[PDB]
Every structure is written in structure tokens, then in C-alpha cells.
Structure 1
Amino acid sequence: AMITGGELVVRTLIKAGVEHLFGLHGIHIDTIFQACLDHDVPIIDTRHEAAAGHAAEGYARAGAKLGVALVTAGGGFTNAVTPIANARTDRTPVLFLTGSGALRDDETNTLQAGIDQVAMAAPITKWAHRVMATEHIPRLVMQAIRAALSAPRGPVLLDLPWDILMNQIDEDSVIIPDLVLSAHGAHPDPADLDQALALLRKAERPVIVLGSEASRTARKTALSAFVAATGVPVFADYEGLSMLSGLPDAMRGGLVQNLYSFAKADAAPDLVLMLGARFGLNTGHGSGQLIPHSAQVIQVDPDACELGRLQGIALGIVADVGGTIEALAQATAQDAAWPDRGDWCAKVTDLAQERYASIAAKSSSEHALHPFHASQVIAKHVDAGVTVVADGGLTYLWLSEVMSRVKPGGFLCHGYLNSMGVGFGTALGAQVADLEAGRRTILVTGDGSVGYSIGEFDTLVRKQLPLIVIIMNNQSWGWTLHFQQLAVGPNRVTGTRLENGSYHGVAAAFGADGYHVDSVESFSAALAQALAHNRPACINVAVALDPIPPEELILIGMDPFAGSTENLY
């Protein structure tokens, strides 16, 4: 039979294992919506293309698989640009399918046409391309999927002109290729692997740090077997934290940020094995505050430019992170036993403890709910059956202090782009993936950031996605207000106050359950109750603004744990 170009798209996605799409309808892509309808492939349709974009990101990250976003020509594409950029930075594998104007109508000042969408996306994608012929669709879709999924993972843009999608062709005349692309990543040269293990055995206080590429491959069995065998404690940036959840307690270092205080306590690591973590925002750049200059660093990353980017390293390996973990588990399952490391792991715990307890002791909820105390209420409920997504500024910095000591099913935080607002879309897509794994999704966001995508409460009710949305409400763009006060002056605060709005009332108006709470008592009760029902909820938590999370000070070169501190201004 004759079939549309939109039909060729969907047949090809199906063959690649895609089971959900995220998008927002337009006539230019209707052929694709119609094919999905015929094939029972759900499309999670949102109220903003950005939210669809971020949802496909969230589905990808929470599910360790390909996310797919689908947007129409013109405004559709331009509204998807923030998700694309965020995926590029975060190394998230998303295929963005966009419509564009018909090639037949090129340069007619017509509806939604006239944007060079590929030129716009080229600098924020692994690959961006416009399809010139209907027969090409299946190979170019499959090619795009291979680009997205190979290491380092990333976003890909495929532009599908309206006429190219509406054109019909004989199904007997075009092949739909399979997805033939090894799931097992490339391993290191054995010589390099041996050299790494030689260094690791010789080392006195070694640590491992995991990045995004370790979550994408999700090689949990190999990882736990490798750590079980060597005894080495493991830390991670935010993307890598859920990979620590299946490790024996005594070797979970938690978030890499805890390494801060080690130098001051004469316990700086002398070896660091970086598995797909990068020198950048989460690892203290080239400063040495987390990853010491004096330490022998072994870095594994699929992108050779990332190796020793900001610091000298002892050994640099271009390989897949997953394949590397696998190879380490192999090499390690057969050789002599490894040195003890029990004393070193006890140290790591003890320091994570001191940090936590120092914050606990400093935090009061006497006059208003302290953000730390609010974050602790959430942690009580974080097991393997929960995915936590984090947005906001101060909100997530506070939340980060409770996360090292619990074992989340998933944990999705900001990446280098720090784009406020992305959390809602992200969490929605995470929740889609999580229903399939029987997990529950919780978004912890700030009163500012929730504003960006607050329409998606509609989408939760319509699609019966039981996401819980917790709003740490400090009546402000909090982090930026703090900058204004600290970096400029007491009364130079301007454009950062949000002294208005009933966010639970908004959610109620869209049909979600709305709670407003202001204390530890009331918040625990409300969260328990929302977790008990399989319904979407919004909990508006009134929270203090003044308190300064330690990571605020650290990310501008000040010691939050000393007595005094110089302001670099």
C-alpha cells in the first residue's frame, strides 16, 4: 500500500524500540500523529513545546534509553531550543523531530516557514539535518538514533519538511533498517587498564567519581562487583548519584561535593578515577578543591577533549564508560585480593557525617521552616522506588545535603546550563518512564522555577501522571537575591522578589490536589497523604529565605565551615 512519510518515521521509531513520544501537535506533523494512533504509540502531548522537550530528556534519563520529542514547524522548533541545549550539555540522548515548511513552498513568506532550523541547532546538537526526500526517512531516522545513542550521548535534530511527510510511497519500495548498533560499549586497551589498576592498588586513599555516561549505560552489576572486589569508595556528580544506590553502604561516598573538606582534614585523595565525570562546574573546575592537584588522576571519557581539560592527569583513556566498568569488573574478578581500605572508607563516612551534622546543628525552624528541615522531610521517603527531580536554586543546593545518605531510584538535577524551569517537563517525562518501572516521581522546585511550566498541571491531570510537585516557596528568585545582597549590597535587591501567588490554588484550578503547609508537622503529613494516593499533587511549602546553603558559598570560593571568610566580590 501507499504510506505517508510520517508513517515511515513511526515504523522506523518502532523498530528502534521507541514506545512513547513527547510533543505538541501542528498540522505540519499530523502524519506522524496519525501513524502513532494507528500503531498505538502514545504521544504525551503537553501545553508548551519546551516541556515536551524536557520531558523527553526526563524520560531518557530516568529510563536509561532514547527519548523522543516531536514539535511542529516554526514556533514549534524555536520553543524546543532550550531542551536541545540542555540535552547537549547534560549528554542526554534525545531525538528531536521537527516539522518545517514544504520544500515546494520554499521562499513564499508562508505560514511557519522561513527559519533555518538546522543552522540554529547545529551548534547545540551532535547532529542536525533536514531530510530532502521521503525515501530517505528510514535510514536518516535510524542514523540519527545511532548518533544520539553512541557515546557521548547527546541530542540530535531531524527536520522533516511538510511535503516530505505528506508524500506517499509504495511500502514495497523502501526498507526499514534495523537498529544495528552494539549495546556493549568499547573497552580500554588492556595495557591502559592494567596501568590504571596498578595505580589503584598502589594508592593509599583512592576514590572513584561517576558522571552522566555511567547512568546511560547503567552497568550496575559490573560496578558493584568491581567495588566489592577493590574496596574503593565511590562518589558521583548529580547525574551519577543513582548509580551509587546499589552499592554496599561502606563504599558510598555520595555526592562529589563532599570531597571539599577532605584537604583541611589531611585526607585528600591521592588517586581519583574519573568515570565520565568532567572537569567543570560539579567537580570544582581546575581549582583542586575536590579533585586535588597532588592526586594521580585517571580519567575515562569518550570525548578526548575532556581529558585533563583543566588539570594535569596521570592517565587518559578514550572509551565508553560502561564498557570500561565492565572491563574493570573482569580484570578484578580474577587477580589477587586487594588491600584493605576499611580505615579509608570509615574516614569518608565520618567526614560526610561531620558535614551533615554541622548543618543540622546550625539550622533552626523556630520562626519559619528552614529549607534543610524541609529537605529532611523529603528524604524519609526516598528509597529505590522513587525518582527525585530537582529545580530551583537555593532549593536544590539545600536538597543536595540530604541526598548523599539515601538511595534514590533516580535523581535528576541541573547540569552545567543551570536552566531554571526545566524541572517540571523533566519530571513529567521521568514519571512516564517510571510508571513502567513502578516508581514514583517527586519534583522539588522553587517558587520561581515552577512559574516557567506551570501549565503542565493540566497535562498531569489529562494524562493521569501522578507526579508530586513540591514547591519550596521563599517568595523570591532566591539564589539571585542572595547574590544581590552578598555581591553588591544590603539594599540593592531588585527584580528578584516574588511576593505573590497561590501555587496550590493554581494546581487546584487545573484539577490537581493542592496542599499549603508551613511546618515540619504539616509537611510530613501532606507528603505522606499525597504519596498514599495515585494522583497528581502540588504541595506549597512556605520556607525561609535568609539561610545560606553551604554550596552557595563554596561555588564562589568561600569556606562555609571555617569561622571567618574573605569576599572576592
Structure 2
Amino acid sequence: AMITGGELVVRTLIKAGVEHLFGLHGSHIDTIFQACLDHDVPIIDTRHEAAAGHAAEGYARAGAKLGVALVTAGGGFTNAVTPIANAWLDRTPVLFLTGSGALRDDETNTLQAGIDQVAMAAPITKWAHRVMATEHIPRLVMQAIRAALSAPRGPVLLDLPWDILMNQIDEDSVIIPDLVLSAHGARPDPADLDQALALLRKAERPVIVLGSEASRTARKTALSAFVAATGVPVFADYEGLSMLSGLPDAMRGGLVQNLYSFAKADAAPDLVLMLGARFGLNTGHGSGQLIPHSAQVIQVDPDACELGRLQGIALGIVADVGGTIEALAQATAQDAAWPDRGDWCAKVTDLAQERYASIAAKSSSEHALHPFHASQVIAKHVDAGVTVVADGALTYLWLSEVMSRVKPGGFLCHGYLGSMGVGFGTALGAQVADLEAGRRTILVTGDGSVGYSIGEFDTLVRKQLPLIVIIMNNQSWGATLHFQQLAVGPNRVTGTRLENGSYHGVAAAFGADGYHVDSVESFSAALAQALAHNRPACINVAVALDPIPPEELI
């Protein structure tokens, strides 16, 4: 009859439909550990709260569902800050449950109390709030969850004082509410939908560009019905990429990064339909080399701030990307008489094919194994059954170069935050999600980036998570080392040389299979063996440093 506040937290999460938590133990949050123990709710405990946070993100991104991070007071929270800020810029839905000092003995210079965690999380969350009463728990947890899931998606900080968590209340007294929130999003007004549809019908070279908000709602089947009736090519930023994985092969434009050299071939797009993709790092900023200044733009985004923020656009809609896609598939259904778009699809296909073949031709692997070739080795293993997690600068923009012509189940790369090393936690969490859906996760990170959360090879072994960490090891902080040469001068490389350490040796110590390879065939075989067993694996890949990825030259 008497239950702890920590019980209420878990019961509300049970009701909300959560089946996994990612975290690190603390006395302050043990009531939640105890309650999860009782209801068989697995907490995937890590070796760093940053890894736990990133794992909640990874789980959310690869699962298209809610992520839950569980951290303790003080350092527990501060260690989760990078995942918080990363989820913020990436529009990913994570509930960050955090402990704090007890309200009784507030301002007593005590263990793990003393820092305004709500004030700290404020600038980088949709909502950050501290619970003031134990009976408020179910309603406030449910409130926090609604905030995170609705467009635009984002992180929420729920601060649960040790006080409030240890408190015992009569269970029959406080009501645990249901998650009452519509799964379908808000659609555009039929007038703007009639307009956007009209504007794209009379169009010589139209393109769709998908963003993160497309993957959250993940309304794939509707995207098919819409793309089939209209026959319009679809591009995406890294986060939208996997949404193209189910499109008929002809209208798969790939990553928006290659809407770039459309300038030399007349191919400057006529009308661009942006669906949750923002103006910034991912779409060539305002520099307009990706989204051409002379194109008419139709932008759909949950936040009006994003509506033509860097370039003057034509039609500015504010609705949910998911509902918007649904509204487009619904209208496009009976309107089944659409213009001839055979030879714009071929152009988009052929221009991306060009840039690809062009780089393959300039890629030599004599004396040193080329990053491009090691990228093609992973690429040959990429279908809907595989999630790919990208980390590590030079690593990921070489990886980006092969990623457009395969159909990944998921693809989790860096957002605007671009925090080197977020990939390990992300991939761990993604592997937990992919286990339910019968899929495999592969992290592709740099030698420098992996050392951020290298202790997570332990967690992979302890929890038996079959993640294959692939390390592009060019003995350095790659992209930065290039900046020191290309931007400063040839012999001005300081603090970027990382010429020490056997990474497979580290993985071997934590009990995970370590491979160090240095050639195409050996790496190809190592990866094949890694996939072949259901066990965590490190593949230390000795790779070339000197070559320059095309993205860097821009």
C-alpha cells in the first residue's frame, strides 16, 4: 500500500510503454533501480553517464521511439550534459531522468547537491523542471514525455530530488495517468496543400529533401504512396537518409550533400520541397550551393523559426512532417494523373553515380589502405537489416561518400553539435533497439573519437550486446590535422598526432574480440567474421591519413 516515489516513476514509465532504460547507478536514484528490478525493466548500466545519455538517444533514433536516460545527482547529471545538448540540436526525443540533492537539507553544502541542474539544462531542452512533491510524479513524468515526443522532438529534463524519490505514499491515493497523445501529427491546411501540390505539378526539376522529423514519425509506407504517384526524387540529410531505404530505386537521390555539383550540369533544382530539413550545416547553410537561391522553396517545419531562416522561401507551412507526408499521400491517391518525370530521375541518379565513380577513380590503395576502400567494405554489408552509426570526422565524410547507394535500416551520424565521440553510446543504445527488430548495429568511428567512451567495450560484454565497433585508425585526430596544414601551413601540426595505442588490445581486455587489419581482404574478412558471430567486436582498421574527402574541399 505504501510505495516509494521511485516506484511511481517506474510505474508511469511502464504505462507510457517504455521497456528500456540506460543509466549509471547512484544512491540518489536507487528507488528507481529497485522498482525496475521488481517489474523486470532492464536498465542498461554503462561506464559513463555520457555513454548512457547517448545510448538513450541511439535507442530513440534507431527505434523511432522514446529514449530514457537515468542519471544520479551532481556528476551523474553534469556527465549527461553533452547527450542533452546533442539531443537538443538533433531534435531527438529523450527523457533525461536525473537525481538531485534532497529538498530537505537544501543549501547545506552536501554530497551531490549544490548545482542548479534545471538552470543548466534550461538552454538545451524543450522543458527542464524539478519535482516538488512525490504525488506530482506520475503527472509530471507524463507531462515531460508528451513534451519530448511532440514536434519538434527534443530532450526533456525531469529532476527528481532524493527526498521525493525515497518518500513513501499510499499507492491507492495517487492516480497514474495514461499517455493520451495522438500518434498522428497535425496536417497542413488543404489550401496550402492544394497550393504546394499545384506548385510541384508544374515543375521541370522538383526534389524532396527529408530531415530528422521525417525519421521520428517514420511514416515510411505513406512516403511510398506519395513518391510513387508523383515520381519525384528524394534526398535527405544524414538523419533522414534511412527514410529513403524503402523507396523504389529510381527516385532515391541520396544525401543532399550531392545536390552540390548540380550547378555545372544545368541541374540546379527547379522547386525544392523541404520536409523538416533545416537551413544550416546539413543543407549548405545560406551559401545556397545545395538549395539554389533561384529555386522556389516549400518548407514544412514544426517551428516557424526554421521557416526560410537563411534564404527567402516561397511557401512557409508549419505542421508535423509526419502528418504532412500523410496528407500528401492521401491527396496524391485519387489524383493519379501526374507529369512525365522519367528523365529527371535518371539525371539525379546519374549525377550521384558520377561523383561516386569519380572518387573511386582517384582512390589508390598502394602503400596505404585508402579510407574510401575501407568505406566500400562496410558498404557491401548494408541493407535494411543494418543500422550504421557514424563518428570521427574524416571517418564519416568518407563514409558519407558510399552511404547514398545502399539502403540502411538506420544511419546515425553527427548533428549540428558535432561532438566527436558521441558514436559509441549512440551505437550501444541503437544495438539494444535493433535487437528487438532483429537487426545489427555497426559503429564506424575514428581512432581519436573511440577513446572518448572506450570503456564501453566492457558494457558490450557485460550486457552481451553484439555491436561491431569499427575504428578508422589513421594514427591521429584526422580532420583537425588537415585543418592545421591546409588552413595554417604544412609543418604546423601540433596536438593532433595520436601515434600510440592498440585499440583491439583494449577491447580484448574487456573481453571483446579484437581484430587489427591493414588491408582490404583482411578487413573484409575480419568484418565478415564479426557479423558471423553474435558477440561484441572491435575491428581496428589501419587506414591512410593523407587523402582528402570531397566535403572538406568546400
Runs of 4+ in 1 over 6 A off after TM superposition: none
Structure 1 residue 37 displacement after superposition: 0.2
For 1:19-63, what per-residue CA distance to the aligned partner results, in whole angstroms no more than 9, with x for missing partners?
000000000000000000000000000000000000000000000
Distance in 1 of aligned mates of 2:345 and 2:117 = 51
Secondary structure of the structure 1 residue equivalent to 2:334: coil
Secondary structure of the structure 1 residue equivalent to 2:172: helix
Structure 1 residue 287 displacement after superposition: 1.1
For 1:133-185, what per-residue CA distance to the aligned partner results, in whole angstroms no more than 9, with x for missing partners?
00000000000000000000000000000010000000110000000000000
Distance in 1 of aligned mates of 2:291 and 2:163 = 53
TM-score when scaled to structure 2? 1.00
Distance in 2 of aligned mates of 1:154 and 1:267 = 36
Say whether the 8 Å CA contact 2:375–2:399 is kept in structure 1: yes
- Pairing of 1:273-292 with structure 2 (within 5 A): 273-292=273-292
Structure 1 residue 251 displacement after superposition: 0.2
Distance in 1 of aligned mates of 2:159 and 2:550 = 44
Structure 1 residue 335 displacement after superposition: 1.3
Distance in 2 of aligned mates of 1:79 and 1:336 = 53
Secondary structure of the structure 2 residue equivalent to 1:40: coil
Distance in 2 of aligned mates of 1:271 and 1:287 = 17
Distance in 2 of aligned mates of 1:200 and 1:110 = 62
Structure 1 residue 351 displacement after superposition: 0.3
For 1:334-385, what per-residue CA distance to the aligned partner results, in whole angstroms no more than 9, with x for missing partners?
1141001110000001100110011000000001100000000000100110
Secondary structure of the structure 2 residue equivalent to 1:103: coil
Correspondence for 1:105: 105
Structure 1 residue 264 displacement after superposition: 1.2
Structure 1 residue 263 displacement after superposition: 1.1
Distance in 1 of aligned mates of 2:203 and 2:444 = 39
For 1:272-293, what per-residue CA distance to the aligned partner results, in whole angstroms no more than 9, with x for missing partners?
0000000000100111100111
Secondary structure of the structure 1 residue equivalent to 2:419: coil
Distance in 2 of aligned mates of 1:455 and 1:161 = 29
Correspondence for 2:227: 227
- What's the % identity of the aligned pairs? 99
Distance in 2 of aligned mates of 1:186 and 1:236 = 22
Say whether the 8 Å CA contact 2:185–2:322 is kept in structure 1: yes
Distance in 2 of aligned mates of 1:120 and 1:433 = 29
Say whether the 8 Å CA contact 2:205–2:270 is kept in structure 1: yes
Secondary structure of the structure 1 residue equivalent to 2:14: helix
Distance in 2 of aligned mates of 1:106 and 1:276 = 43
Secondary structure of the structure 1 residue equivalent to 2:268: coil
Distance in 2 of aligned mates of 1:132 and 1:512 = 44
For 1:464-492, what per-residue CA distance to the aligned partner results, in whole angstroms no more than 9, with x for missing partners?
00000000000000000000000000011
For 1:181-203, what per-residue CA distance to the aligned partner results, in whole angstroms no more than 9, with x for missing partners?
00000000000001000000011
Distance in 2 of aligned mates of 1:264 and 1:281 = 22
For 1:365-423, what per-residue CA distance to the aligned partner results, in whole angstroms no more than 9, with x for missing partners?
00110000000000010011000000000000000010100000000000000000000
For 1:489-532, what per-residue CA distance to the aligned partner results, in whole angstroms no more than 9, with x for missing partners?
00111000000000000000000000000000100000001100
For 1:52-88, what per-residue CA distance to the aligned partner results, in whole angstroms no more than 9, with x for missing partners?
0000000000000000000000000000000000000
Distance in 2 of aligned mates of 1:282 and 1:367 = 34
Correspondence for 1:34: 34
Secondary structure of the structure 1 residue equivalent to 2:452: helix
- For structure 2, which runs of at least 5 residues remain unmatched after alignment? none
Distance in 1 of aligned mates of 2:29 and 2:145 = 19
Distance in 1 of aligned mates of 2:523 and 2:218 = 34
For 1:109-145, what per-residue CA distance to the aligned partner results, in whole angstroms no more than 9, with x for missing partners?
1111100000000000000000000000000000000
Distance in 1 of aligned mates of 2:444 and 2:484 = 24
Say whether the 8 Å CA contact 2:69–2:96 is kept in structure 1: yes
Correspondence for 1:314: 314
Structure 1 residue 230 displacement after superposition: 0.3
| Aligned positions, number | 554
- For structure 1, which runs of at least 5 residues remain unmatched after alignment? 553-567
Distance in 2 of aligned mates of 1:265 and 1:463 = 52
Correspondence for 1:481: 481
Secondary structure of the structure 1 residue equivalent to 2:259: helix
Structure 1's 336 and 525: CA in aligned 2 closer, same or farther, altered over 3 A?
A: closer
Correspondence for 2:409: 409
Distance in 2 of aligned mates of 1:490 and 1:317 = 49
Distance in 1 of aligned mates of 2:551 and 2:498 = 23
Distance in 2 of aligned mates of 1:197 and 1:420 = 41
Distance in 2 of aligned mates of 1:97 and 1:413 = 24
Distance in 1 of aligned mates of 2:340 and 2:44 = 51
Correspondence for 2:24: 24
Secondary structure of the structure 2 residue equivalent to 1:453: coil
Say whether the 8 Å CA contact 2:87–2:93 is kept in structure 1: yes
Distance in 1 of aligned mates of 2:542 and 2:278 = 36
Distance in 1 of aligned mates of 2:309 and 2:506 = 46
For 1:74-111, what per-residue CA distance to the aligned partner results, in whole angstroms no more than 9, with x for missing partners?
00000000000000000000000000010011011111
TM-score when scaled to structure 1? 0.97
Distance in 1 of aligned mates of 2:115 and 2:196 = 49
Secondary structure of the structure 2 residue equivalent to 1:411: strand
Structure 1 residue 7 displacement after superposition: 0.2
Correspondence for 1:507: 507
Secondary structure of the structure 2 residue equivalent to 1:550: coil
Distance in 2 of aligned mates of 1:327 and 1:377 = 40
Secondary structure of the structure 2 residue equivalent to 1:110: coil
Secondary structure of the structure 2 residue equivalent to 1:515: strand
For 1:208-255, what per-residue CA distance to the aligned partner results, in whole angstroms no more than 9, with x for missing partners?
000000000010110011000001000000000000000000000000
Say whether the 8 Å CA contact 2:229–2:336 is kept in structure 1: no
Secondary structure of the structure 2 residue equivalent to 1:407: coil
Cα RMSD (Å): 0.8
For 1:398-457, what per-residue CA distance to the aligned partner results, in whole angstroms no more than 9, with x for missing partners?
000101000000000000000000000000000000000000000000000000000000
Structure 1's 336 and 462: CA in aligned 2 closer, same or farther, altered over 3 A?
A: closer
Distance in 2 of aligned mates of 1:471 and 1:268 = 37
Secondary structure of the structure 1 residue equivalent to 2:98: strand
Say whether the 8 Å CA contact 2:5–2:164 is kept in structure 1: yes
Say whether the 8 Å CA contact 2:92–2:155 is kept in structure 1: yes
Distance in 1 of aligned mates of 2:310 and 2:17 = 39
Distance in 1 of aligned mates of 2:28 and 2:453 = 24
Secondary structure of the structure 2 residue equivalent to 1:272: strand
Distance in 2 of aligned mates of 1:144 and 1:433 = 22
Distance in 2 of aligned mates of 1:397 and 1:411 = 13
For 1:6-29, what per-residue CA distance to the aligned partner results, in whole angstroms no more than 9, with x for missing partners?
000000000000000000000000
Correspondence for 1:373: 373
Distance in 1 of aligned mates of 2:163 and 2:539 = 46
